[PDB]
Design an enzyme around this catalytic site. Structure first.
Site, PDB file in Angstrom:
ATOM      1  N   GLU A  75     -44.849  33.147 -22.432  1.00  0.00           N
ATOM      2  CA  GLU A  75     -45.787  32.441 -23.132  1.00  0.00           C
ATOM      3  C   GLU A  75     -47.231  33.169 -23.433  1.00  0.00           C
ATOM      4  O   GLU A  75     -47.696  33.135 -24.437  1.00  0.00           O
ATOM      5  CB  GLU A  75     -46.045  31.231 -22.158  1.00  0.00           C
ATOM      6  CG  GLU A  75     -44.916  30.259 -22.332  1.00  0.00           C
ATOM      7  CD  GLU A  75     -44.655  29.561 -23.499  1.00  0.00           C
ATOM      8  OE1 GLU A  75     -45.383  29.603 -24.307  1.00  0.00           O
ATOM      9  OE2 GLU A  75     -43.828  28.802 -23.239  1.00  0.00           O
TER      10      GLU A  75
ATOM     11  N   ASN B 193     -50.880  25.293 -33.006  1.00  0.00           N
ATOM     12  CA  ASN B 193     -49.569  24.889 -33.291  1.00  0.00           C
ATOM     13  C   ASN B 193     -49.631  24.418 -34.930  1.00  0.00           C
ATOM     14  O   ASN B 193     -50.655  23.933 -35.233  1.00  0.00           O
ATOM     15  CB  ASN B 193     -49.063  23.902 -32.496  1.00  0.00           C
ATOM     16  CG  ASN B 193     -48.952  24.591 -31.132  1.00  0.00           C
ATOM     17  OD1 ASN B 193     -48.457  25.406 -30.986  1.00  0.00           O
ATOM     18  ND2 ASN B 193     -49.426  23.636 -30.194  1.00  0.00           N
TER      19      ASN B 193
ATOM     20  N   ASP C 107     -48.839  21.332 -35.899  1.00  0.00           N
ATOM     21  CA  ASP C 107     -49.321  20.299 -35.866  1.00  0.00           C
ATOM     22  C   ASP C 107     -50.857  20.086 -35.622  1.00  0.00           C
ATOM     23  O   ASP C 107     -51.511  18.932 -35.603  1.00  0.00           O
ATOM     24  CB  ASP C 107     -48.366  19.268 -35.013  1.00  0.00           C
ATOM     25  CG  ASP C 107     -48.708  19.648 -33.453  1.00  0.00           C
ATOM     26  OD1 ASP C 107     -49.401  20.564 -32.897  1.00  0.00           O
ATOM     27  OD2 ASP C 107     -48.194  18.885 -32.408  1.00  0.00           O
TER      28      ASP C 107
ATOM     29  N   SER D 200     -52.421  21.078 -32.771  1.00  0.00           N
ATOM     30  CA  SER D 200     -52.528  21.003 -31.273  1.00  0.00           C
ATOM     31  C   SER D 200     -52.773  22.604 -30.973  1.00  0.00           C
ATOM     32  O   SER D 200     -52.462  23.379 -31.784  1.00  0.00           O
ATOM     33  CB  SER D 200     -51.519  20.400 -30.555  1.00  0.00           C
ATOM     34  OG  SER D 200     -50.294  21.100 -30.658  1.00  0.00           O
TER      35      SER D 200
ATOM     36  N   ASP E  95     -52.254  25.565 -27.706  1.00  0.00           N
ATOM     37  CA  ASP E  95     -51.650  25.872 -26.541  1.00  0.00           C
ATOM     38  C   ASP E  95     -52.501  26.734 -25.592  1.00  0.00           C
ATOM     39  O   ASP E  95     -53.131  27.940 -26.381  1.00  0.00           O
ATOM     40  CB  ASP E  95     -50.363  26.690 -26.601  1.00  0.00           C
ATOM     41  CG  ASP E  95     -49.123  25.722 -27.123  1.00  0.00           C
ATOM     42  OD1 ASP E  95     -49.257  24.440 -27.092  1.00  0.00           O
ATOM     43  OD2 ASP E  95     -48.262  26.361 -27.325  1.00  0.00           O
TER      44      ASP E  95
ATOM     45  N   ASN F 183     -50.228  22.690 -23.888  1.00  0.00           N
ATOM     46  CA  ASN F 183     -50.404  22.166 -25.304  1.00  0.00           C
ATOM     47  C   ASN F 183     -51.476  20.873 -25.159  1.00  0.00           C
ATOM     48  O   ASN F 183     -51.179  19.936 -24.253  1.00  0.00           O
ATOM     49  CB  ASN F 183     -49.073  21.758 -25.930  1.00  0.00           C
ATOM     50  CG  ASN F 183     -49.407  21.193 -27.275  1.00  0.00           C
ATOM     51  OD1 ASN F 183     -49.475  20.017 -27.683  1.00  0.00           O
ATOM     52  ND2 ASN F 183     -49.363  22.328 -27.974  1.00  0.00           N
TER      53      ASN F 183
END
Ligand SMILES: [Cl-]
Ligand SMILES: [Cl-]
Ligand SMILES: [Cl-]
Ligand SMILES: [Cl-]
Ligand SMILES: [Cl-]
Ligand SMILES: [Cl-]
Ligand SMILES: [Cl-]
Ligand SMILES: [Cl-]
Ligand code: NA
Length: 129
Positions: free
Chosen positions: A35, A46, A48, A50, A52, A59
């Site tokens: 990650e 991301n 969308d 959002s 992380d 998220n």
């Protein structure tokens, strides 16, 4: 902060993550490796909208507030910036809620794709824990 491998294993164990929800420490270390490469300051946007955050790339769609993810929730009740601290407490407490949400560590797609089913104990091998 960029943790060493054993250093992060030890901090995760300190904070109660070892065997949490049945997931051994190596699973958590492996997830953090893919990650964030063990960097608490990692962020990634991301598709969308959002973002992380942190060592476990938590998220903003569900788990933390960053003020710029429309329609999102903040189920860990924290600012996403808390997830970037050198102190991993906020990330660990939030990860405990995420892994309890029904799909276990599959919540982390990278864990499913790169850690699940592998020899995850390699990630803590040699560490004084
Ligand atoms: Cl490593
Ligand atoms: Cl392990
Ligand atoms: Cl928001
Ligand atoms: Cl922005
Ligand atoms: Cl909420
Ligand atoms: Cl906030
Ligand atoms: Cl820590
Ligand atoms: Cl599970
Ligand atoms: Na949010």
């Amino acid at each position: 902060k960029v943790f060493g491998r054993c250093e992060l294993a030890a901090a995760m164990k300190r904070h109660g993550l070892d065997n949490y929800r049945g997931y051994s420490l190596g699973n958590w270390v492996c997830a953090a490796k893919f990650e964030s490469n063990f960097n608490t300051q990692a962020t990634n946007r991301n598709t969308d909208g959002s973002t992380d955050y942190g060592i476990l790339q938590i998220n903003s769609r569900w788990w933390c507030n960053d003020g710029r993810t429309p329609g999102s929730r903040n189920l860990c009740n924290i600012p996403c910036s808390a997830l970037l601290s050198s102190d991993i407490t906020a990330s660990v407490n939030c990860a405990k809620k995420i892994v309890s949400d029904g799909n276990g560590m599959n919540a982390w797609v990278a864990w499913r794709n790169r850690c699940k089913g592998t020899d995850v104990q390699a990630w803590i091998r040699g560490c004084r824990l």
